[PDB]
Amino acid sequence: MTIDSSGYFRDAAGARFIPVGANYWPASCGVEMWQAWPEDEIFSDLDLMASLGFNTVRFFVRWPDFEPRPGEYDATMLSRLLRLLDACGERGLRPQPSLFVGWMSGGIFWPPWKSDTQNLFSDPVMIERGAAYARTITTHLKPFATHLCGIDLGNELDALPDCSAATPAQVHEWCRRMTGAIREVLPEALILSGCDHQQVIADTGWRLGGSSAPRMVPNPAQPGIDVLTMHGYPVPNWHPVQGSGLADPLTRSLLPFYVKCARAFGPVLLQEFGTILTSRAAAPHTDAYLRAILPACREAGANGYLWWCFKDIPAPLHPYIKNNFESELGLVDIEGRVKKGLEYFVEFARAETQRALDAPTVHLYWPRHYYHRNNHRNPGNEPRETSRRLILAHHLLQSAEEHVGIVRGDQPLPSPSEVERIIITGVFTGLDEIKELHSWVEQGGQLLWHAPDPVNWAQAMSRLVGAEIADYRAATPAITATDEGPYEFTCFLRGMRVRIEPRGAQILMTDNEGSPLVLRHRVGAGCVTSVLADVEASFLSQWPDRQTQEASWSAWYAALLTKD
Amino acid sequence: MTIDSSGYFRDAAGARFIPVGANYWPASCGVEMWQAWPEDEIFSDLDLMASLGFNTVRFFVRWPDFEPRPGEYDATMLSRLLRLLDACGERGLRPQPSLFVGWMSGGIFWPPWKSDTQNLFSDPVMIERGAAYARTITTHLKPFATHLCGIDLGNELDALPDCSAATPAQVHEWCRRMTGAIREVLPEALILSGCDHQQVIADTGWRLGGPRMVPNPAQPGIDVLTMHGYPVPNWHPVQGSGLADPLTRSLLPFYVKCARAFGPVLLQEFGTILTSRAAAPHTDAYLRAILPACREAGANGYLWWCFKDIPAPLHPYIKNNFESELGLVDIEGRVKKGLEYFVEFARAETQRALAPTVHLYWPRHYYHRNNHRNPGNEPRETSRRLILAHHLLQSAEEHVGIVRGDQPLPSPSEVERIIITGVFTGLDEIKELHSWVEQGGQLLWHAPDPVNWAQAMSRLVGAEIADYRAATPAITATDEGPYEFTCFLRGMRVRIEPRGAQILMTDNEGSPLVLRHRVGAGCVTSVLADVEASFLSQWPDRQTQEASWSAWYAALLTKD
Amino acid sequence: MTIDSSGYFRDAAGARFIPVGANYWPASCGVEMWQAWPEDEIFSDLDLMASLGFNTVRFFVRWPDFEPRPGEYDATMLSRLLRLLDACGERGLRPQPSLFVGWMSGGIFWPPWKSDTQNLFSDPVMIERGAAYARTITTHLKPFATHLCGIDLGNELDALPDCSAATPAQVHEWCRRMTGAIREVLPEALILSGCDHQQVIADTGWRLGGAPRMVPNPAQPGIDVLTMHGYPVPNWHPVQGSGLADPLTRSLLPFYVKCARAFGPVLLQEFGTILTSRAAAPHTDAYLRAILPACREAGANGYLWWCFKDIPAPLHPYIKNNFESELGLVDIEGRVKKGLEYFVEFARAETQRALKVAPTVHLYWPRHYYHRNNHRNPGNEPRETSRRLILAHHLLQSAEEHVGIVRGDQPLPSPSEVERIIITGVFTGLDEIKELHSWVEQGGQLLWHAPDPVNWAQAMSRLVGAEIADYRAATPAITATDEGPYEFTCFLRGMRVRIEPRGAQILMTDNEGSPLVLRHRVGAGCVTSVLADVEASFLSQWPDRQTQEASWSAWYAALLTKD
């Protein structure tokens, strides 16, 4: 099992395959599966999966179950593991076993010999016990090595409180150690991270973006990980921009946007996706939601699709008691029937696996230094702040009917024949980034620069924007108008506003009190359009008036975008 | 002493005893009393307390005075304690001595061998010296065991910063050790926590709601719960307006009701803070409201803070000089004008020692720190909503109680009507609520929670979620006027489709806002907005809005 | 050298000396100077400084270059350090070396054997390694003792993350120890802290206001000369000004200097315009002509610009904070940039004035200014306090007052020297209230914005002239002076009290009747008390500054009293 050059899974025989299926816990016992072991129920569920066309099943090796005392592995659980691996094989399902679990449905399930004082990532004993546990489980997977769908490091390790208390360096080291332990048994295994969208919207230490001989791996900030993962749900307050739900185009753009970011750093599996609401009343809306997000996730480059989760789980036990929405996430009801509203996933999965037998018209700028914790070279970017601006720009550009890509500022910029238009959404850019943006613009790039950064505004930025800072001025709102309507910007980058003097640039727009607000500067073959306001922040500050303002928000980008 | 079946003190004679009196430091020296020891002034203050009809005095054994070096107790201080205890008995006053002090009047006073890096609850050495210090003092109290009004563990231990750095489990264990230590000497002593209202409005590890049988197992070895309360606007999570404000006046009875649901409650500290002659018409009216209300909430005793004005020009009265003017009596030994009703009240309660129409819902999981079964409730958030609803309902002439969700719901004969004020409820609570509604209960459910909205919640509310919707304001009207709700639970709104429930009110865009659902013999009225948080968000407009706020509950409340 | 009784440097001959010059890194390499050592370029930059009339240059001994391994001091660096000191004396420039660097231009540069888990101030190994580093470099300085312009302890030690993790007592002891180490080698050296305006606007442990060797500010033991740094950048201050042209922005640096001056001698060790482009030239010129005399009037004893050269070196930290690349005084061809020539002129005038050898209102600096581990502090915190001080200071200057600072941790000067005091809603303990009572009785004129209810007992009642009858809803208070309406939305600690007079007169009421401003004669003086948080209310109206600011100045003028 291997990942091909276009980021797709390949089986031992070198044919491509698209993982499709479900994350799994039995209905009757949820997370207690290893203890309750309702084997007829499990095998009947695997039969149901196979009959729907699924070719993979993600399941969780719950660590306390398997190592109840330090170094003593439960032989009954290991035998149940082997029975499961066997039963999936005979039914055409490639198991995707998840080791470090850990985080699950609102609970946290660790071995009793780990105290809350022992940080999963940094504690010396936990590192050793974790490595031995990874090697032990991998040993028991080795007889199935060619029938796996990768080995999942753990479930949403970036959601753990332990991420706040361990340094990024320590998380990086733990990941190296746990992948290395797996490779002491299966050196060629495909390992997935198991992380969710907090890779994009927070700094948990689980990062997209390093610079690389340990192993050839696409994302060196996650050493030893062959396949990046993305998880995503429509719940409005699980994201830094609050959408309105299943019918909202903003909400629908979130998961494809996350996949697009991940895809820029390596192959990406949509390892978890769900509607959360799955009742009969929700059926018209969940159906339309799925018909939007799944093809968009495909176009964004996902290499596989696993629903959360297979069955409703009426088990009256932790953590389904305190977060009872977790009890009704099944693709399938009690009778083994696909729930009204969700059938499209079945149709899409069958389409995708028969498939396995263009272009973006604008790119959002991902800054060279994205994560802030212990980053001494970062000019001030923070994931939650950057990602709020990227999410909204991404959605509003798609409402202007643009095809939106991501371009990486920590890599040389693609020549303007590949990436022709770049939008910087008020993120902070260092000297090297400016120089490269200059050379890119010189060969013909069209740059739309929202709120260039005064902290990095010296000679280099002045020659690129085409203007010098004459003085600061009060950060009071700027009111203006394009040819389609009026605009008011209340936010400015770092809370500061500047008075500029043109030094090559033309004044494309002024505020209503006469001063320059949008500049336009031609530099070699390209053209820099700079806006002296924090556009995305201003729009986000007027979120309660979203209904009536959104059309003009999106019309803003269209008016200012130029073409060679 | 002993605590009877109804939560009141009993003396050796088996008579009911209602403690009435004051917390005490001397005027001339304040917290330095054990060092300065003005014995004549002290004994004369004890005289005046007795002449006023008091039967209890609360005073503080200040640990640094008694244990200036580890394991070395200061015999001079112990002599002084004996003289004090003797002087109280000779004068008719039951001493309530408070051990771990500690926290006092804006200062913190620990022995000099307790480093700032040594947490009081979790440090191994501190725990052992604490147990040893508690035993030692209880040894010197034993000669008076039949004359104490209980032993007070310490003053407002829940207010210490150490509460923040120690886990709830470590606080629980410290409480078990120290009460266990006292009981090695006086196994039958009545022990009191000494805690204030932060038991309700914060998670300090001093908790209402979970060996020798105690009423409140979260405080192991404690016999009598305590409550402290002052009208200061910004000492509470809802800003009242002071002595004349019915909201501020409802705060202390509210806290007492909450504590009373978990066990017997002494009103161990209450005061007006403002005691000047200019304040006198207002202190008089405030005390006339809260003392009867606290009685009806179930307080079993009343101790004023504090007995004398304290002009002592020393720490901590220099930096918080309002502490210098909390006396019940001036320096001429006269009860301050405006405070006299407390003497009248106390006399009345010791002479006599010879209702709900709706209940507020206290969630099963109240405290968040290291609580893995908690669906999201935090004391400050929950108490905010509870304080406001309690006050609004009392303005609607309702007599409000508290029903505990961590215990089986009483039948609708006892508790007929329940309001859930936008708190988070697990599956087990929903199932128990549904069973209680089945038997006739009337449920007013403000903001049923999407995170626990699956099948059980849908059958009880009588609707399923069709989708989320924008969390924009909901405007509506009852038959008495308009309403606007800007706050929703977890900052999310849902679109519902009915499945058995009627639509009672819509927002002015047509979509359902309030539902009403007959379930068995009872009825669930559900509001799809965070009602209490919305009102609280309109706090600047309280004066013009408060009337409709309490009208809201009156409009929606169901009776059989 | 020595500091005289007025607060000014004096050379060995006993003649007054005003440091004027620049902070320096070479343009080609920036902070890598010790490693790159472009000596020809360095020595000609020193020529340039002397030709401009400067007498002092401030440079930074970067620790990791001078001790790459514990206990082993690089000898090439020590020889380069020596050649640099030679070049300064050979050109009339007094070197001011900075030892603990450390913090520079948005980067942090420590030796590699210091891990990030080792706090500079509290880690025992770092403490002892630091003292040895101090003593070692001081030893290479003492050949030049009579030619230094003091020794600078470090650069903005108070900006370090370590300040948050080390207690104030730990920072205090570290400074005791490091100054002690310098004095082992040069017992009479002039030592400077190297701190900036965070001394005033935060609690970093680097504080104003505390047998040891007598120093002017005991909170910083062993420090002979306090330092101040100041830049116009709007969001580097707790009150957001509008830039080079904003009187508020221009008042900040003098305000910080006046505060530090109330505790000891102050060197304007860093100042700059940040914006130095030719487009900025009209505004830098005007900003410099304002702040430089005003800092002289505030008591600064020297002036060092940041920094001498533009630095295009494409290396850390110029890459992430590229504004740091264009702070030079002179351009690439070596001429003073347009808009900045006034500093050279002001420097030459200060040289001359030194060759030949007014406060109408005082702002109340509370007895307990810093909050960390201060058990006697009634609740003052530097950022809150300085926000109100800065605003009041600027507004009073706009009403054409000359504004001083009076220290509440010292006996109050008699009304002959300090006649009028303004308390800008800060928290006052009992001992401070009695001292204010005695001062007013002697004739003091007190304007008391927001007397603190937490300290409102009998002493405050007697001084204010009123008692608290009750709290009241903290809704806004609307009133009118003879010159316009006012609305106050902010009240101290978010609480509002209903008062009852007891000797005071009701000077002003709110538009619903209740007292708002009181006046109370006490002995020969007079207390005017406002029952609203004046400076916070004005700060809450910052978006409307442009239309509102004049009425804010007029508020102070209306209420200020005389005999």
PDB file of C-alpha atoms in Angstrom, chain C residues 419-523:
ATOM      1  CA  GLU C 419      -0.220  74.099  45.177  1.00  0.00           C
ATOM      2  CA  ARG C 420      -2.611  72.036  43.057  1.00  0.00           C
ATOM      3  CA  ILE C 421      -2.947  68.265  42.863  1.00  0.00           C
ATOM      4  CA  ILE C 422      -5.182  66.210  40.581  1.00  0.00           C
ATOM      5  CA  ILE C 423      -6.087  62.623  41.482  1.00  0.00           C
ATOM      6  CA  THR C 424      -7.157  60.864  38.273  1.00  0.00           C
ATOM      7  CA  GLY C 425      -9.338  58.140  39.758  1.00  0.00           C
ATOM      8  CA  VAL C 426      -6.547  56.116  41.337  1.00  0.00           C
ATOM      9  CA  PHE C 427      -6.806  54.161  44.564  1.00  0.00           C
ATOM     10  CA  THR C 428      -5.680  55.805  47.809  1.00  0.00           C
ATOM     11  CA  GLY C 429      -5.062  54.062  51.118  1.00  0.00           C
ATOM     12  CA  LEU C 430      -5.784  55.505  54.564  1.00  0.00           C
ATOM     13  CA  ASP C 431      -2.236  56.808  55.031  1.00  0.00           C
ATOM     14  CA  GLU C 432      -2.467  58.592  51.699  1.00  0.00           C
ATOM     15  CA  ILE C 433      -5.827  60.145  52.652  1.00  0.00           C
ATOM     16  CA  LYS C 434      -4.435  61.547  55.933  1.00  0.00           C
ATOM     17  CA  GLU C 435      -1.408  62.966  54.124  1.00  0.00           C
ATOM     18  CA  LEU C 436      -3.717  64.590  51.565  1.00  0.00           C
ATOM     19  CA  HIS C 437      -5.855  65.949  54.408  1.00  0.00           C
ATOM     20  CA  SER C 438      -2.788  67.545  56.004  1.00  0.00           C
ATOM     21  CA  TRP C 439      -1.680  68.974  52.655  1.00  0.00           C
ATOM     22  CA  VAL C 440      -5.086  70.482  51.861  1.00  0.00           C
ATOM     23  CA  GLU C 441      -5.292  71.894  55.404  1.00  0.00           C
ATOM     24  CA  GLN C 442      -2.008  73.751  54.783  1.00  0.00           C
ATOM     25  CA  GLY C 443      -3.640  75.291  51.666  1.00  0.00           C
ATOM     26  CA  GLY C 444      -3.587  72.591  48.992  1.00  0.00           C
ATOM     27  CA  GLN C 445      -6.041  72.754  46.094  1.00  0.00           C
ATOM     28  CA  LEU C 446      -7.196  69.170  45.406  1.00  0.00           C
ATOM     29  CA  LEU C 447      -9.189  68.049  42.347  1.00  0.00           C
ATOM     30  CA  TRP C 448     -10.278  64.488  43.132  1.00  0.00           C
ATOM     31  CA  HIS C 449     -11.722  62.564  40.222  1.00  0.00           C
ATOM     32  CA  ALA C 450     -13.564  59.474  41.504  1.00  0.00           C
ATOM     33  CA  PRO C 451     -12.795  59.044  45.229  1.00  0.00           C
ATOM     34  CA  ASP C 452     -12.540  55.341  45.879  1.00  0.00           C
ATOM     35  CA  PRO C 453     -15.556  53.747  47.660  1.00  0.00           C
ATOM     36  CA  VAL C 454     -13.340  50.850  48.795  1.00  0.00           C
ATOM     37  CA  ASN C 455     -11.467  53.431  50.856  1.00  0.00           C
ATOM     38  CA  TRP C 456     -14.478  55.622  51.685  1.00  0.00           C
ATOM     39  CA  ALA C 457     -14.756  55.505  55.469  1.00  0.00           C
ATOM     40  CA  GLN C 458     -14.473  58.349  58.016  1.00  0.00           C
ATOM     41  CA  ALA C 459     -11.144  59.784  56.841  1.00  0.00           C
ATOM     42  CA  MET C 460     -12.293  60.057  53.211  1.00  0.00           C
ATOM     43  CA  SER C 461     -15.662  61.400  54.399  1.00  0.00           C
ATOM     44  CA  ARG C 462     -13.946  64.179  56.387  1.00  0.00           C
ATOM     45  CA  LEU C 463     -11.735  65.148  53.444  1.00  0.00           C
ATOM     46  CA  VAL C 464     -14.382  64.928  50.710  1.00  0.00           C
ATOM     47  CA  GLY C 465     -17.025  66.413  53.001  1.00  0.00           C
ATOM     48  CA  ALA C 466     -19.748  63.812  52.429  1.00  0.00           C
ATOM     49  CA  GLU C 467     -20.872  60.326  53.454  1.00  0.00           C
ATOM     50  CA  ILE C 468     -22.135  57.437  51.348  1.00  0.00           C
ATOM     51  CA  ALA C 469     -25.885  56.994  51.826  1.00  0.00           C
ATOM     52  CA  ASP C 470     -26.247  54.018  49.461  1.00  0.00           C
ATOM     53  CA  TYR C 471     -25.007  52.577  46.224  1.00  0.00           C
ATOM     54  CA  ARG C 472     -27.011  53.385  43.113  1.00  0.00           C
ATOM     55  CA  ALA C 473     -27.278  52.009  39.600  1.00  0.00           C
ATOM     56  CA  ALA C 474     -24.086  52.795  37.702  1.00  0.00           C
ATOM     57  CA  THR C 475     -26.052  54.308  34.746  1.00  0.00           C
ATOM     58  CA  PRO C 476     -24.551  57.399  33.044  1.00  0.00           C
ATOM     59  CA  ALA C 477     -24.430  60.783  34.738  1.00  0.00           C
ATOM     60  CA  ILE C 478     -25.418  63.739  32.516  1.00  0.00           C
ATOM     61  CA  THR C 479     -24.531  67.259  33.645  1.00  0.00           C
ATOM     62  CA  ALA C 480     -23.531  70.712  32.400  1.00  0.00           C
ATOM     63  CA  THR C 481     -20.718  73.089  33.150  1.00  0.00           C
ATOM     64  CA  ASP C 482     -21.052  76.777  32.248  1.00  0.00           C
ATOM     65  CA  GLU C 483     -19.361  75.809  28.962  1.00  0.00           C
ATOM     66  CA  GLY C 484     -21.291  72.728  27.814  1.00  0.00           C
ATOM     67  CA  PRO C 485     -22.865  69.342  28.517  1.00  0.00           C
ATOM     68  CA  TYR C 486     -20.991  66.327  29.796  1.00  0.00           C
ATOM     69  CA  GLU C 487     -21.915  62.683  29.995  1.00  0.00           C
ATOM     70  CA  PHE C 488     -19.971  60.247  32.191  1.00  0.00           C
ATOM     71  CA  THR C 489     -20.544  56.530  31.600  1.00  0.00           C
ATOM     72  CA  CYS C 490     -17.681  55.232  33.755  1.00  0.00           C
ATOM     73  CA  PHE C 491     -17.464  55.039  37.542  1.00  0.00           C
ATOM     74  CA  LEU C 492     -14.580  53.803  39.674  1.00  0.00           C
ATOM     75  CA  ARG C 493     -14.750  50.008  39.985  1.00  0.00           C
ATOM     76  CA  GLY C 494     -17.997  50.108  38.022  1.00  0.00           C
ATOM     77  CA  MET C 495     -19.863  51.319  41.108  1.00  0.00           C
ATOM     78  CA  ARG C 496     -21.836  54.468  41.783  1.00  0.00           C
ATOM     79  CA  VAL C 497     -22.698  55.903  45.194  1.00  0.00           C
ATOM     80  CA  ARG C 498     -25.428  58.244  46.404  1.00  0.00           C
ATOM     81  CA  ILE C 499     -23.852  60.728  48.799  1.00  0.00           C
ATOM     82  CA  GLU C 500     -25.086  63.007  51.560  1.00  0.00           C
ATOM     83  CA  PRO C 501     -23.137  66.236  52.224  1.00  0.00           C
ATOM     84  CA  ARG C 502     -21.353  66.706  55.533  1.00  0.00           C
ATOM     85  CA  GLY C 503     -19.600  70.061  55.086  1.00  0.00           C
ATOM     86  CA  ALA C 504     -19.238  70.085  51.306  1.00  0.00           C
ATOM     87  CA  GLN C 505     -21.280  72.228  48.934  1.00  0.00           C
ATOM     88  CA  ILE C 506     -22.967  70.813  45.850  1.00  0.00           C
ATOM     89  CA  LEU C 507     -21.006  72.494  43.052  1.00  0.00           C
ATOM     90  CA  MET C 508     -22.762  70.620  40.225  1.00  0.00           C
ATOM     91  CA  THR C 509     -25.584  68.113  39.975  1.00  0.00           C
ATOM     92  CA  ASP C 510     -26.648  65.686  37.275  1.00  0.00           C
ATOM     93  CA  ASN C 511     -29.679  66.474  35.164  1.00  0.00           C
ATOM     94  CA  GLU C 512     -31.872  64.398  37.510  1.00  0.00           C
ATOM     95  CA  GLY C 513     -30.938  66.304  40.668  1.00  0.00           C
ATOM     96  CA  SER C 514     -28.368  64.211  42.541  1.00  0.00           C
ATOM     97  CA  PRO C 515     -24.980  65.666  43.560  1.00  0.00           C
ATOM     98  CA  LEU C 516     -22.161  65.044  41.069  1.00  0.00           C
ATOM     99  CA  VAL C 517     -19.393  67.539  41.917  1.00  0.00           C
ATOM    100  CA  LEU C 518     -18.676  68.708  45.463  1.00  0.00           C
ATOM    101  CA  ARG C 519     -16.551  71.501  46.877  1.00  0.00           C
ATOM    102  CA  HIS C 520     -15.344  71.441  50.455  1.00  0.00           C
ATOM    103  CA  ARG C 521     -13.161  73.966  52.271  1.00  0.00           C
ATOM    104  CA  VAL C 522     -10.634  72.270  54.560  1.00  0.00           C
ATOM    105  CA  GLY C 523      -8.305  74.476  56.606  1.00  0.00           C
TER     106      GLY C 523
END
